[PDB]
Design an enzyme around this catalytic site. Structure first.
Site, mmCIF file in Angstrom:
data_model
loop_
_atom_site.group_PDB
_atom_site.id
_atom_site.type_symbol
_atom_site.label_atom_id
_atom_site.label_comp_id
_atom_site.label_asym_id
_atom_site.label_seq_id
_atom_site.Cartn_x
_atom_site.Cartn_y
_atom_site.Cartn_z
ATOM 1 N N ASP A 164 0.858 -1.165 0.000
ATOM 2 C CA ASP A 164 0.000 0.000 0.000
ATOM 3 C C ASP A 164 0.887 1.205 0.000
ATOM 4 O OD1 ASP A 164 -1.908 -1.964 0.624
ATOM 5 O OD2 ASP A 164 -3.040 -0.595 1.818
ATOM 6 N N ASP A 197 -16.488 -2.807 1.892
ATOM 7 C CA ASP A 197 -15.910 -2.399 3.166
ATOM 8 C C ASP A 197 -17.076 -2.344 4.142
ATOM 9 O OD1 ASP A 197 -13.483 -2.057 1.712
ATOM 10 O OD2 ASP A 197 -13.131 -0.035 2.503
#
EC number: 5.3.1.16
Length: 240
Positions: free
Chosen positions: A11, A130
């Site tokens: 990330d 999510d």
């Protein structure tokens, strides 16, 4: 047949490989070079790289050229995510030659765009969910995203090939994956489910692998690999 795909993560924020806690901006621990991290996972036998532009996801600029450099260096499968919300961002992402992208915020905010891109690009598209309880969250102006099951029904019927499932509460915390959630999503679709977040140990990876028969295809692993909880080689051994 028992094998769980493993997708070690890189990330990127401000040019660095970082890990966040609960996906929240400003919780970054920096692990140095994204290119070196990706290269290390590949050298250790990774079959996949899960590569994320967090600046794009958060709307604080982007790392487009660096993300491209990292992808170009990979001979392995690449799953690419981060702020992919329109035609131009999608075009650049796909131009990496990545195996697939993930769309997250876009599915809540512009469901018609996600439908169009699924239709046009098929299994090069996966959708990130999510989840907070039964509610979905994004990174635009939408803390409310929609009901989990209504969104899964719509995406199922639009032909979405695959879902990437995260419980924000487990993310980067090293407290174990939300197995109840993964199984609940497997009940609601026949499409492959990729677990994202929460892995702290080899036993956690074995527990996720136990859901392969129910429809979990893979697990993205971030913090535990960087924290050296186990080696990628050890993870690969444990997931068949």
């Amino acid at each position: 047949m028992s094998k769980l795909e493993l997708l070690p993560a890189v990330d990127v924020r401000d040019g660095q490989a970082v890990r966040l806690v609960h996906g929240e901006s400003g919780t970054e621990t920096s692990y140095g070079s994204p290119l070196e991290a990706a290269l290390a996972w590949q050298r250790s036998g990774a079959e996949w790289l899960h590569l994320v532009d967090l600046d794009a996801a958060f709307g604080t600029g982007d790392n487009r050229a660096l993300i491209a450099e990292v992808a170009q260096a990979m001979d392995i499968k690449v799953e690419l995510s981060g702020g992919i919300r329109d035609d131009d961002t999608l075009a650049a992402a796909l131009a990496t030659g990545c195996t697939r992208v993930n769309l997250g915020t876009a599915a809540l905010e512009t469901p018609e765009w996600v439908a169009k891109v699924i239709a046009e690009h098929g299994d090069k598209i996966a959708v990130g969910l999510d989840v907070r309880g039964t509610t979905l969250r994004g990174r635009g102006w939408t803390r409310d995203g929609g009901d989990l099951y209504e969104t899964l029904d719509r995406l199922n019927k639009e032909g979405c090939a695959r879902y990437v499932v995260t419980d924000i509460a487990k993310d980067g915390t090293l407290q174990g994956p939300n197995l109840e959630l993964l199984k609940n999503v497997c009940a609601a679709t026949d499409r492959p489910v990729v677990a994202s977040g929460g892995v702290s140990s080899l036993d956690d990876l074995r527990a996720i692998a136990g859901l392969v028969p129910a429809g979990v295809e893979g697990a993205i692993v971030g913090k535990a690999l960087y924290a050296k909880a186990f080696t990628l080689e050890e993870a690969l051994e444990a997931t068949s």
